[PDB]
Swiss-Prot record, chain A:
Extracellular domain ranges by topology: 1-222
UniProt superkingdom: Eukaryota
Protein name in the entry: Adhesion G-protein coupled receptor G3, N-terminal fragment
Region (GPS): 188-222
Disulphides: C188-C217, C206-C219
Organism: Homo sapiens (Human)
Glycosylation sites per record: N71, N117, N183
Domain GAIN-B: 80-222
Length: 222, 11
């Protein structure tokens, strides 16, 4: 039972995912036998890879991880919108639909930032729930009474299996929340795999606009 | 690429 947290495994089966989802809460700030923090957050980081590897339009819907893999048509001449509603698996929004409070707009500029004249490219929009443990917190927020991933929730995007890409136009991600307390700002970030030891959150190339009913986050990288 | 909003106490 203790062996599941220490070290990662290649298997990302519905059963296996759930087993590793334990660690999210199992791994308290306290030093423990059980948590290989960097191994586990590597595991989760490699999941969106594993989804990209299989060429399948698939939907996952566990109580922690909601994943959407699908294909995007090149030369669409339209910005792709998606519904990052935490309750439900992500779904592409149509032009005539009301825009969701939680959404991600991917500019048409994505194709130019990919090798060769693309016909169709694979997109993998995941929305993972981290929990209160040390996984995907890092040095910056591991501080007591300091800071935290809002809602212990985290939105995964990946297109065409490119680790680091610079985008012509920035992709915006809208997060819907009630105004946080005074003396408590809210800055958005991405998990830079190579920020510190074991990775950490970075605000590099991600401008944060505070809305009444959330925050908008334009990031010029994917 | 994981993405997230981050609460942080005002310095």
């Amino acid at each position: 039972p203790r062996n599941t947290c220490l070290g990662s495994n290649n298997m990302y089966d519905i059963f296996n995912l759930n087993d590793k989802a334990l660690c999210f809460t199992k791994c308290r700030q306290s030093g423990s036998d059980s948590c290989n923090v960097e191994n586990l957050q590597r595991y989760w980081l490699n999941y969106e890879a594993h989804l990209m590897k299989e060429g399948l339009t698939q939907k996952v819907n566990t109580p922690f991880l909601k994943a959407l893999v699908q294909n995007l048509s090149t030369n669409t001449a339209e910005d792709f919108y998606f519904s990052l509603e935490p309750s439900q698996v992500p779904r592409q929004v149509m032009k005539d639909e009301d825009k969701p409070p939680d959404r991600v707009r991917l500019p048409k500029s994505l194709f130019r930032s990919l090798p060769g004249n693309r016909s169709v490219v694979r997109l993998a929009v995941t929305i993972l729930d981290i929990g209160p443990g040390t996984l995907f917190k890092g040095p910056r927020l591991g501080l007591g009474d300091g800071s935290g991933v809002l809602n212990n929730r985290l939105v995964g995007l990946s297109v065409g299996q490119m680790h680091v890409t610079k985008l012509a136009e920035p992709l915006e991600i809208v997060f819907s929340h009630q105004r946080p307390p005074p003396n408590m700002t809210l800055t958005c970030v991405f998990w830079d795999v190579t920020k510190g030891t074991t990775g950490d959150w970075s605000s590099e190339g991600c401008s944060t606009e505070v809305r009444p009913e959330g925050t908008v986050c334009c990031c010029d990288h994917l």
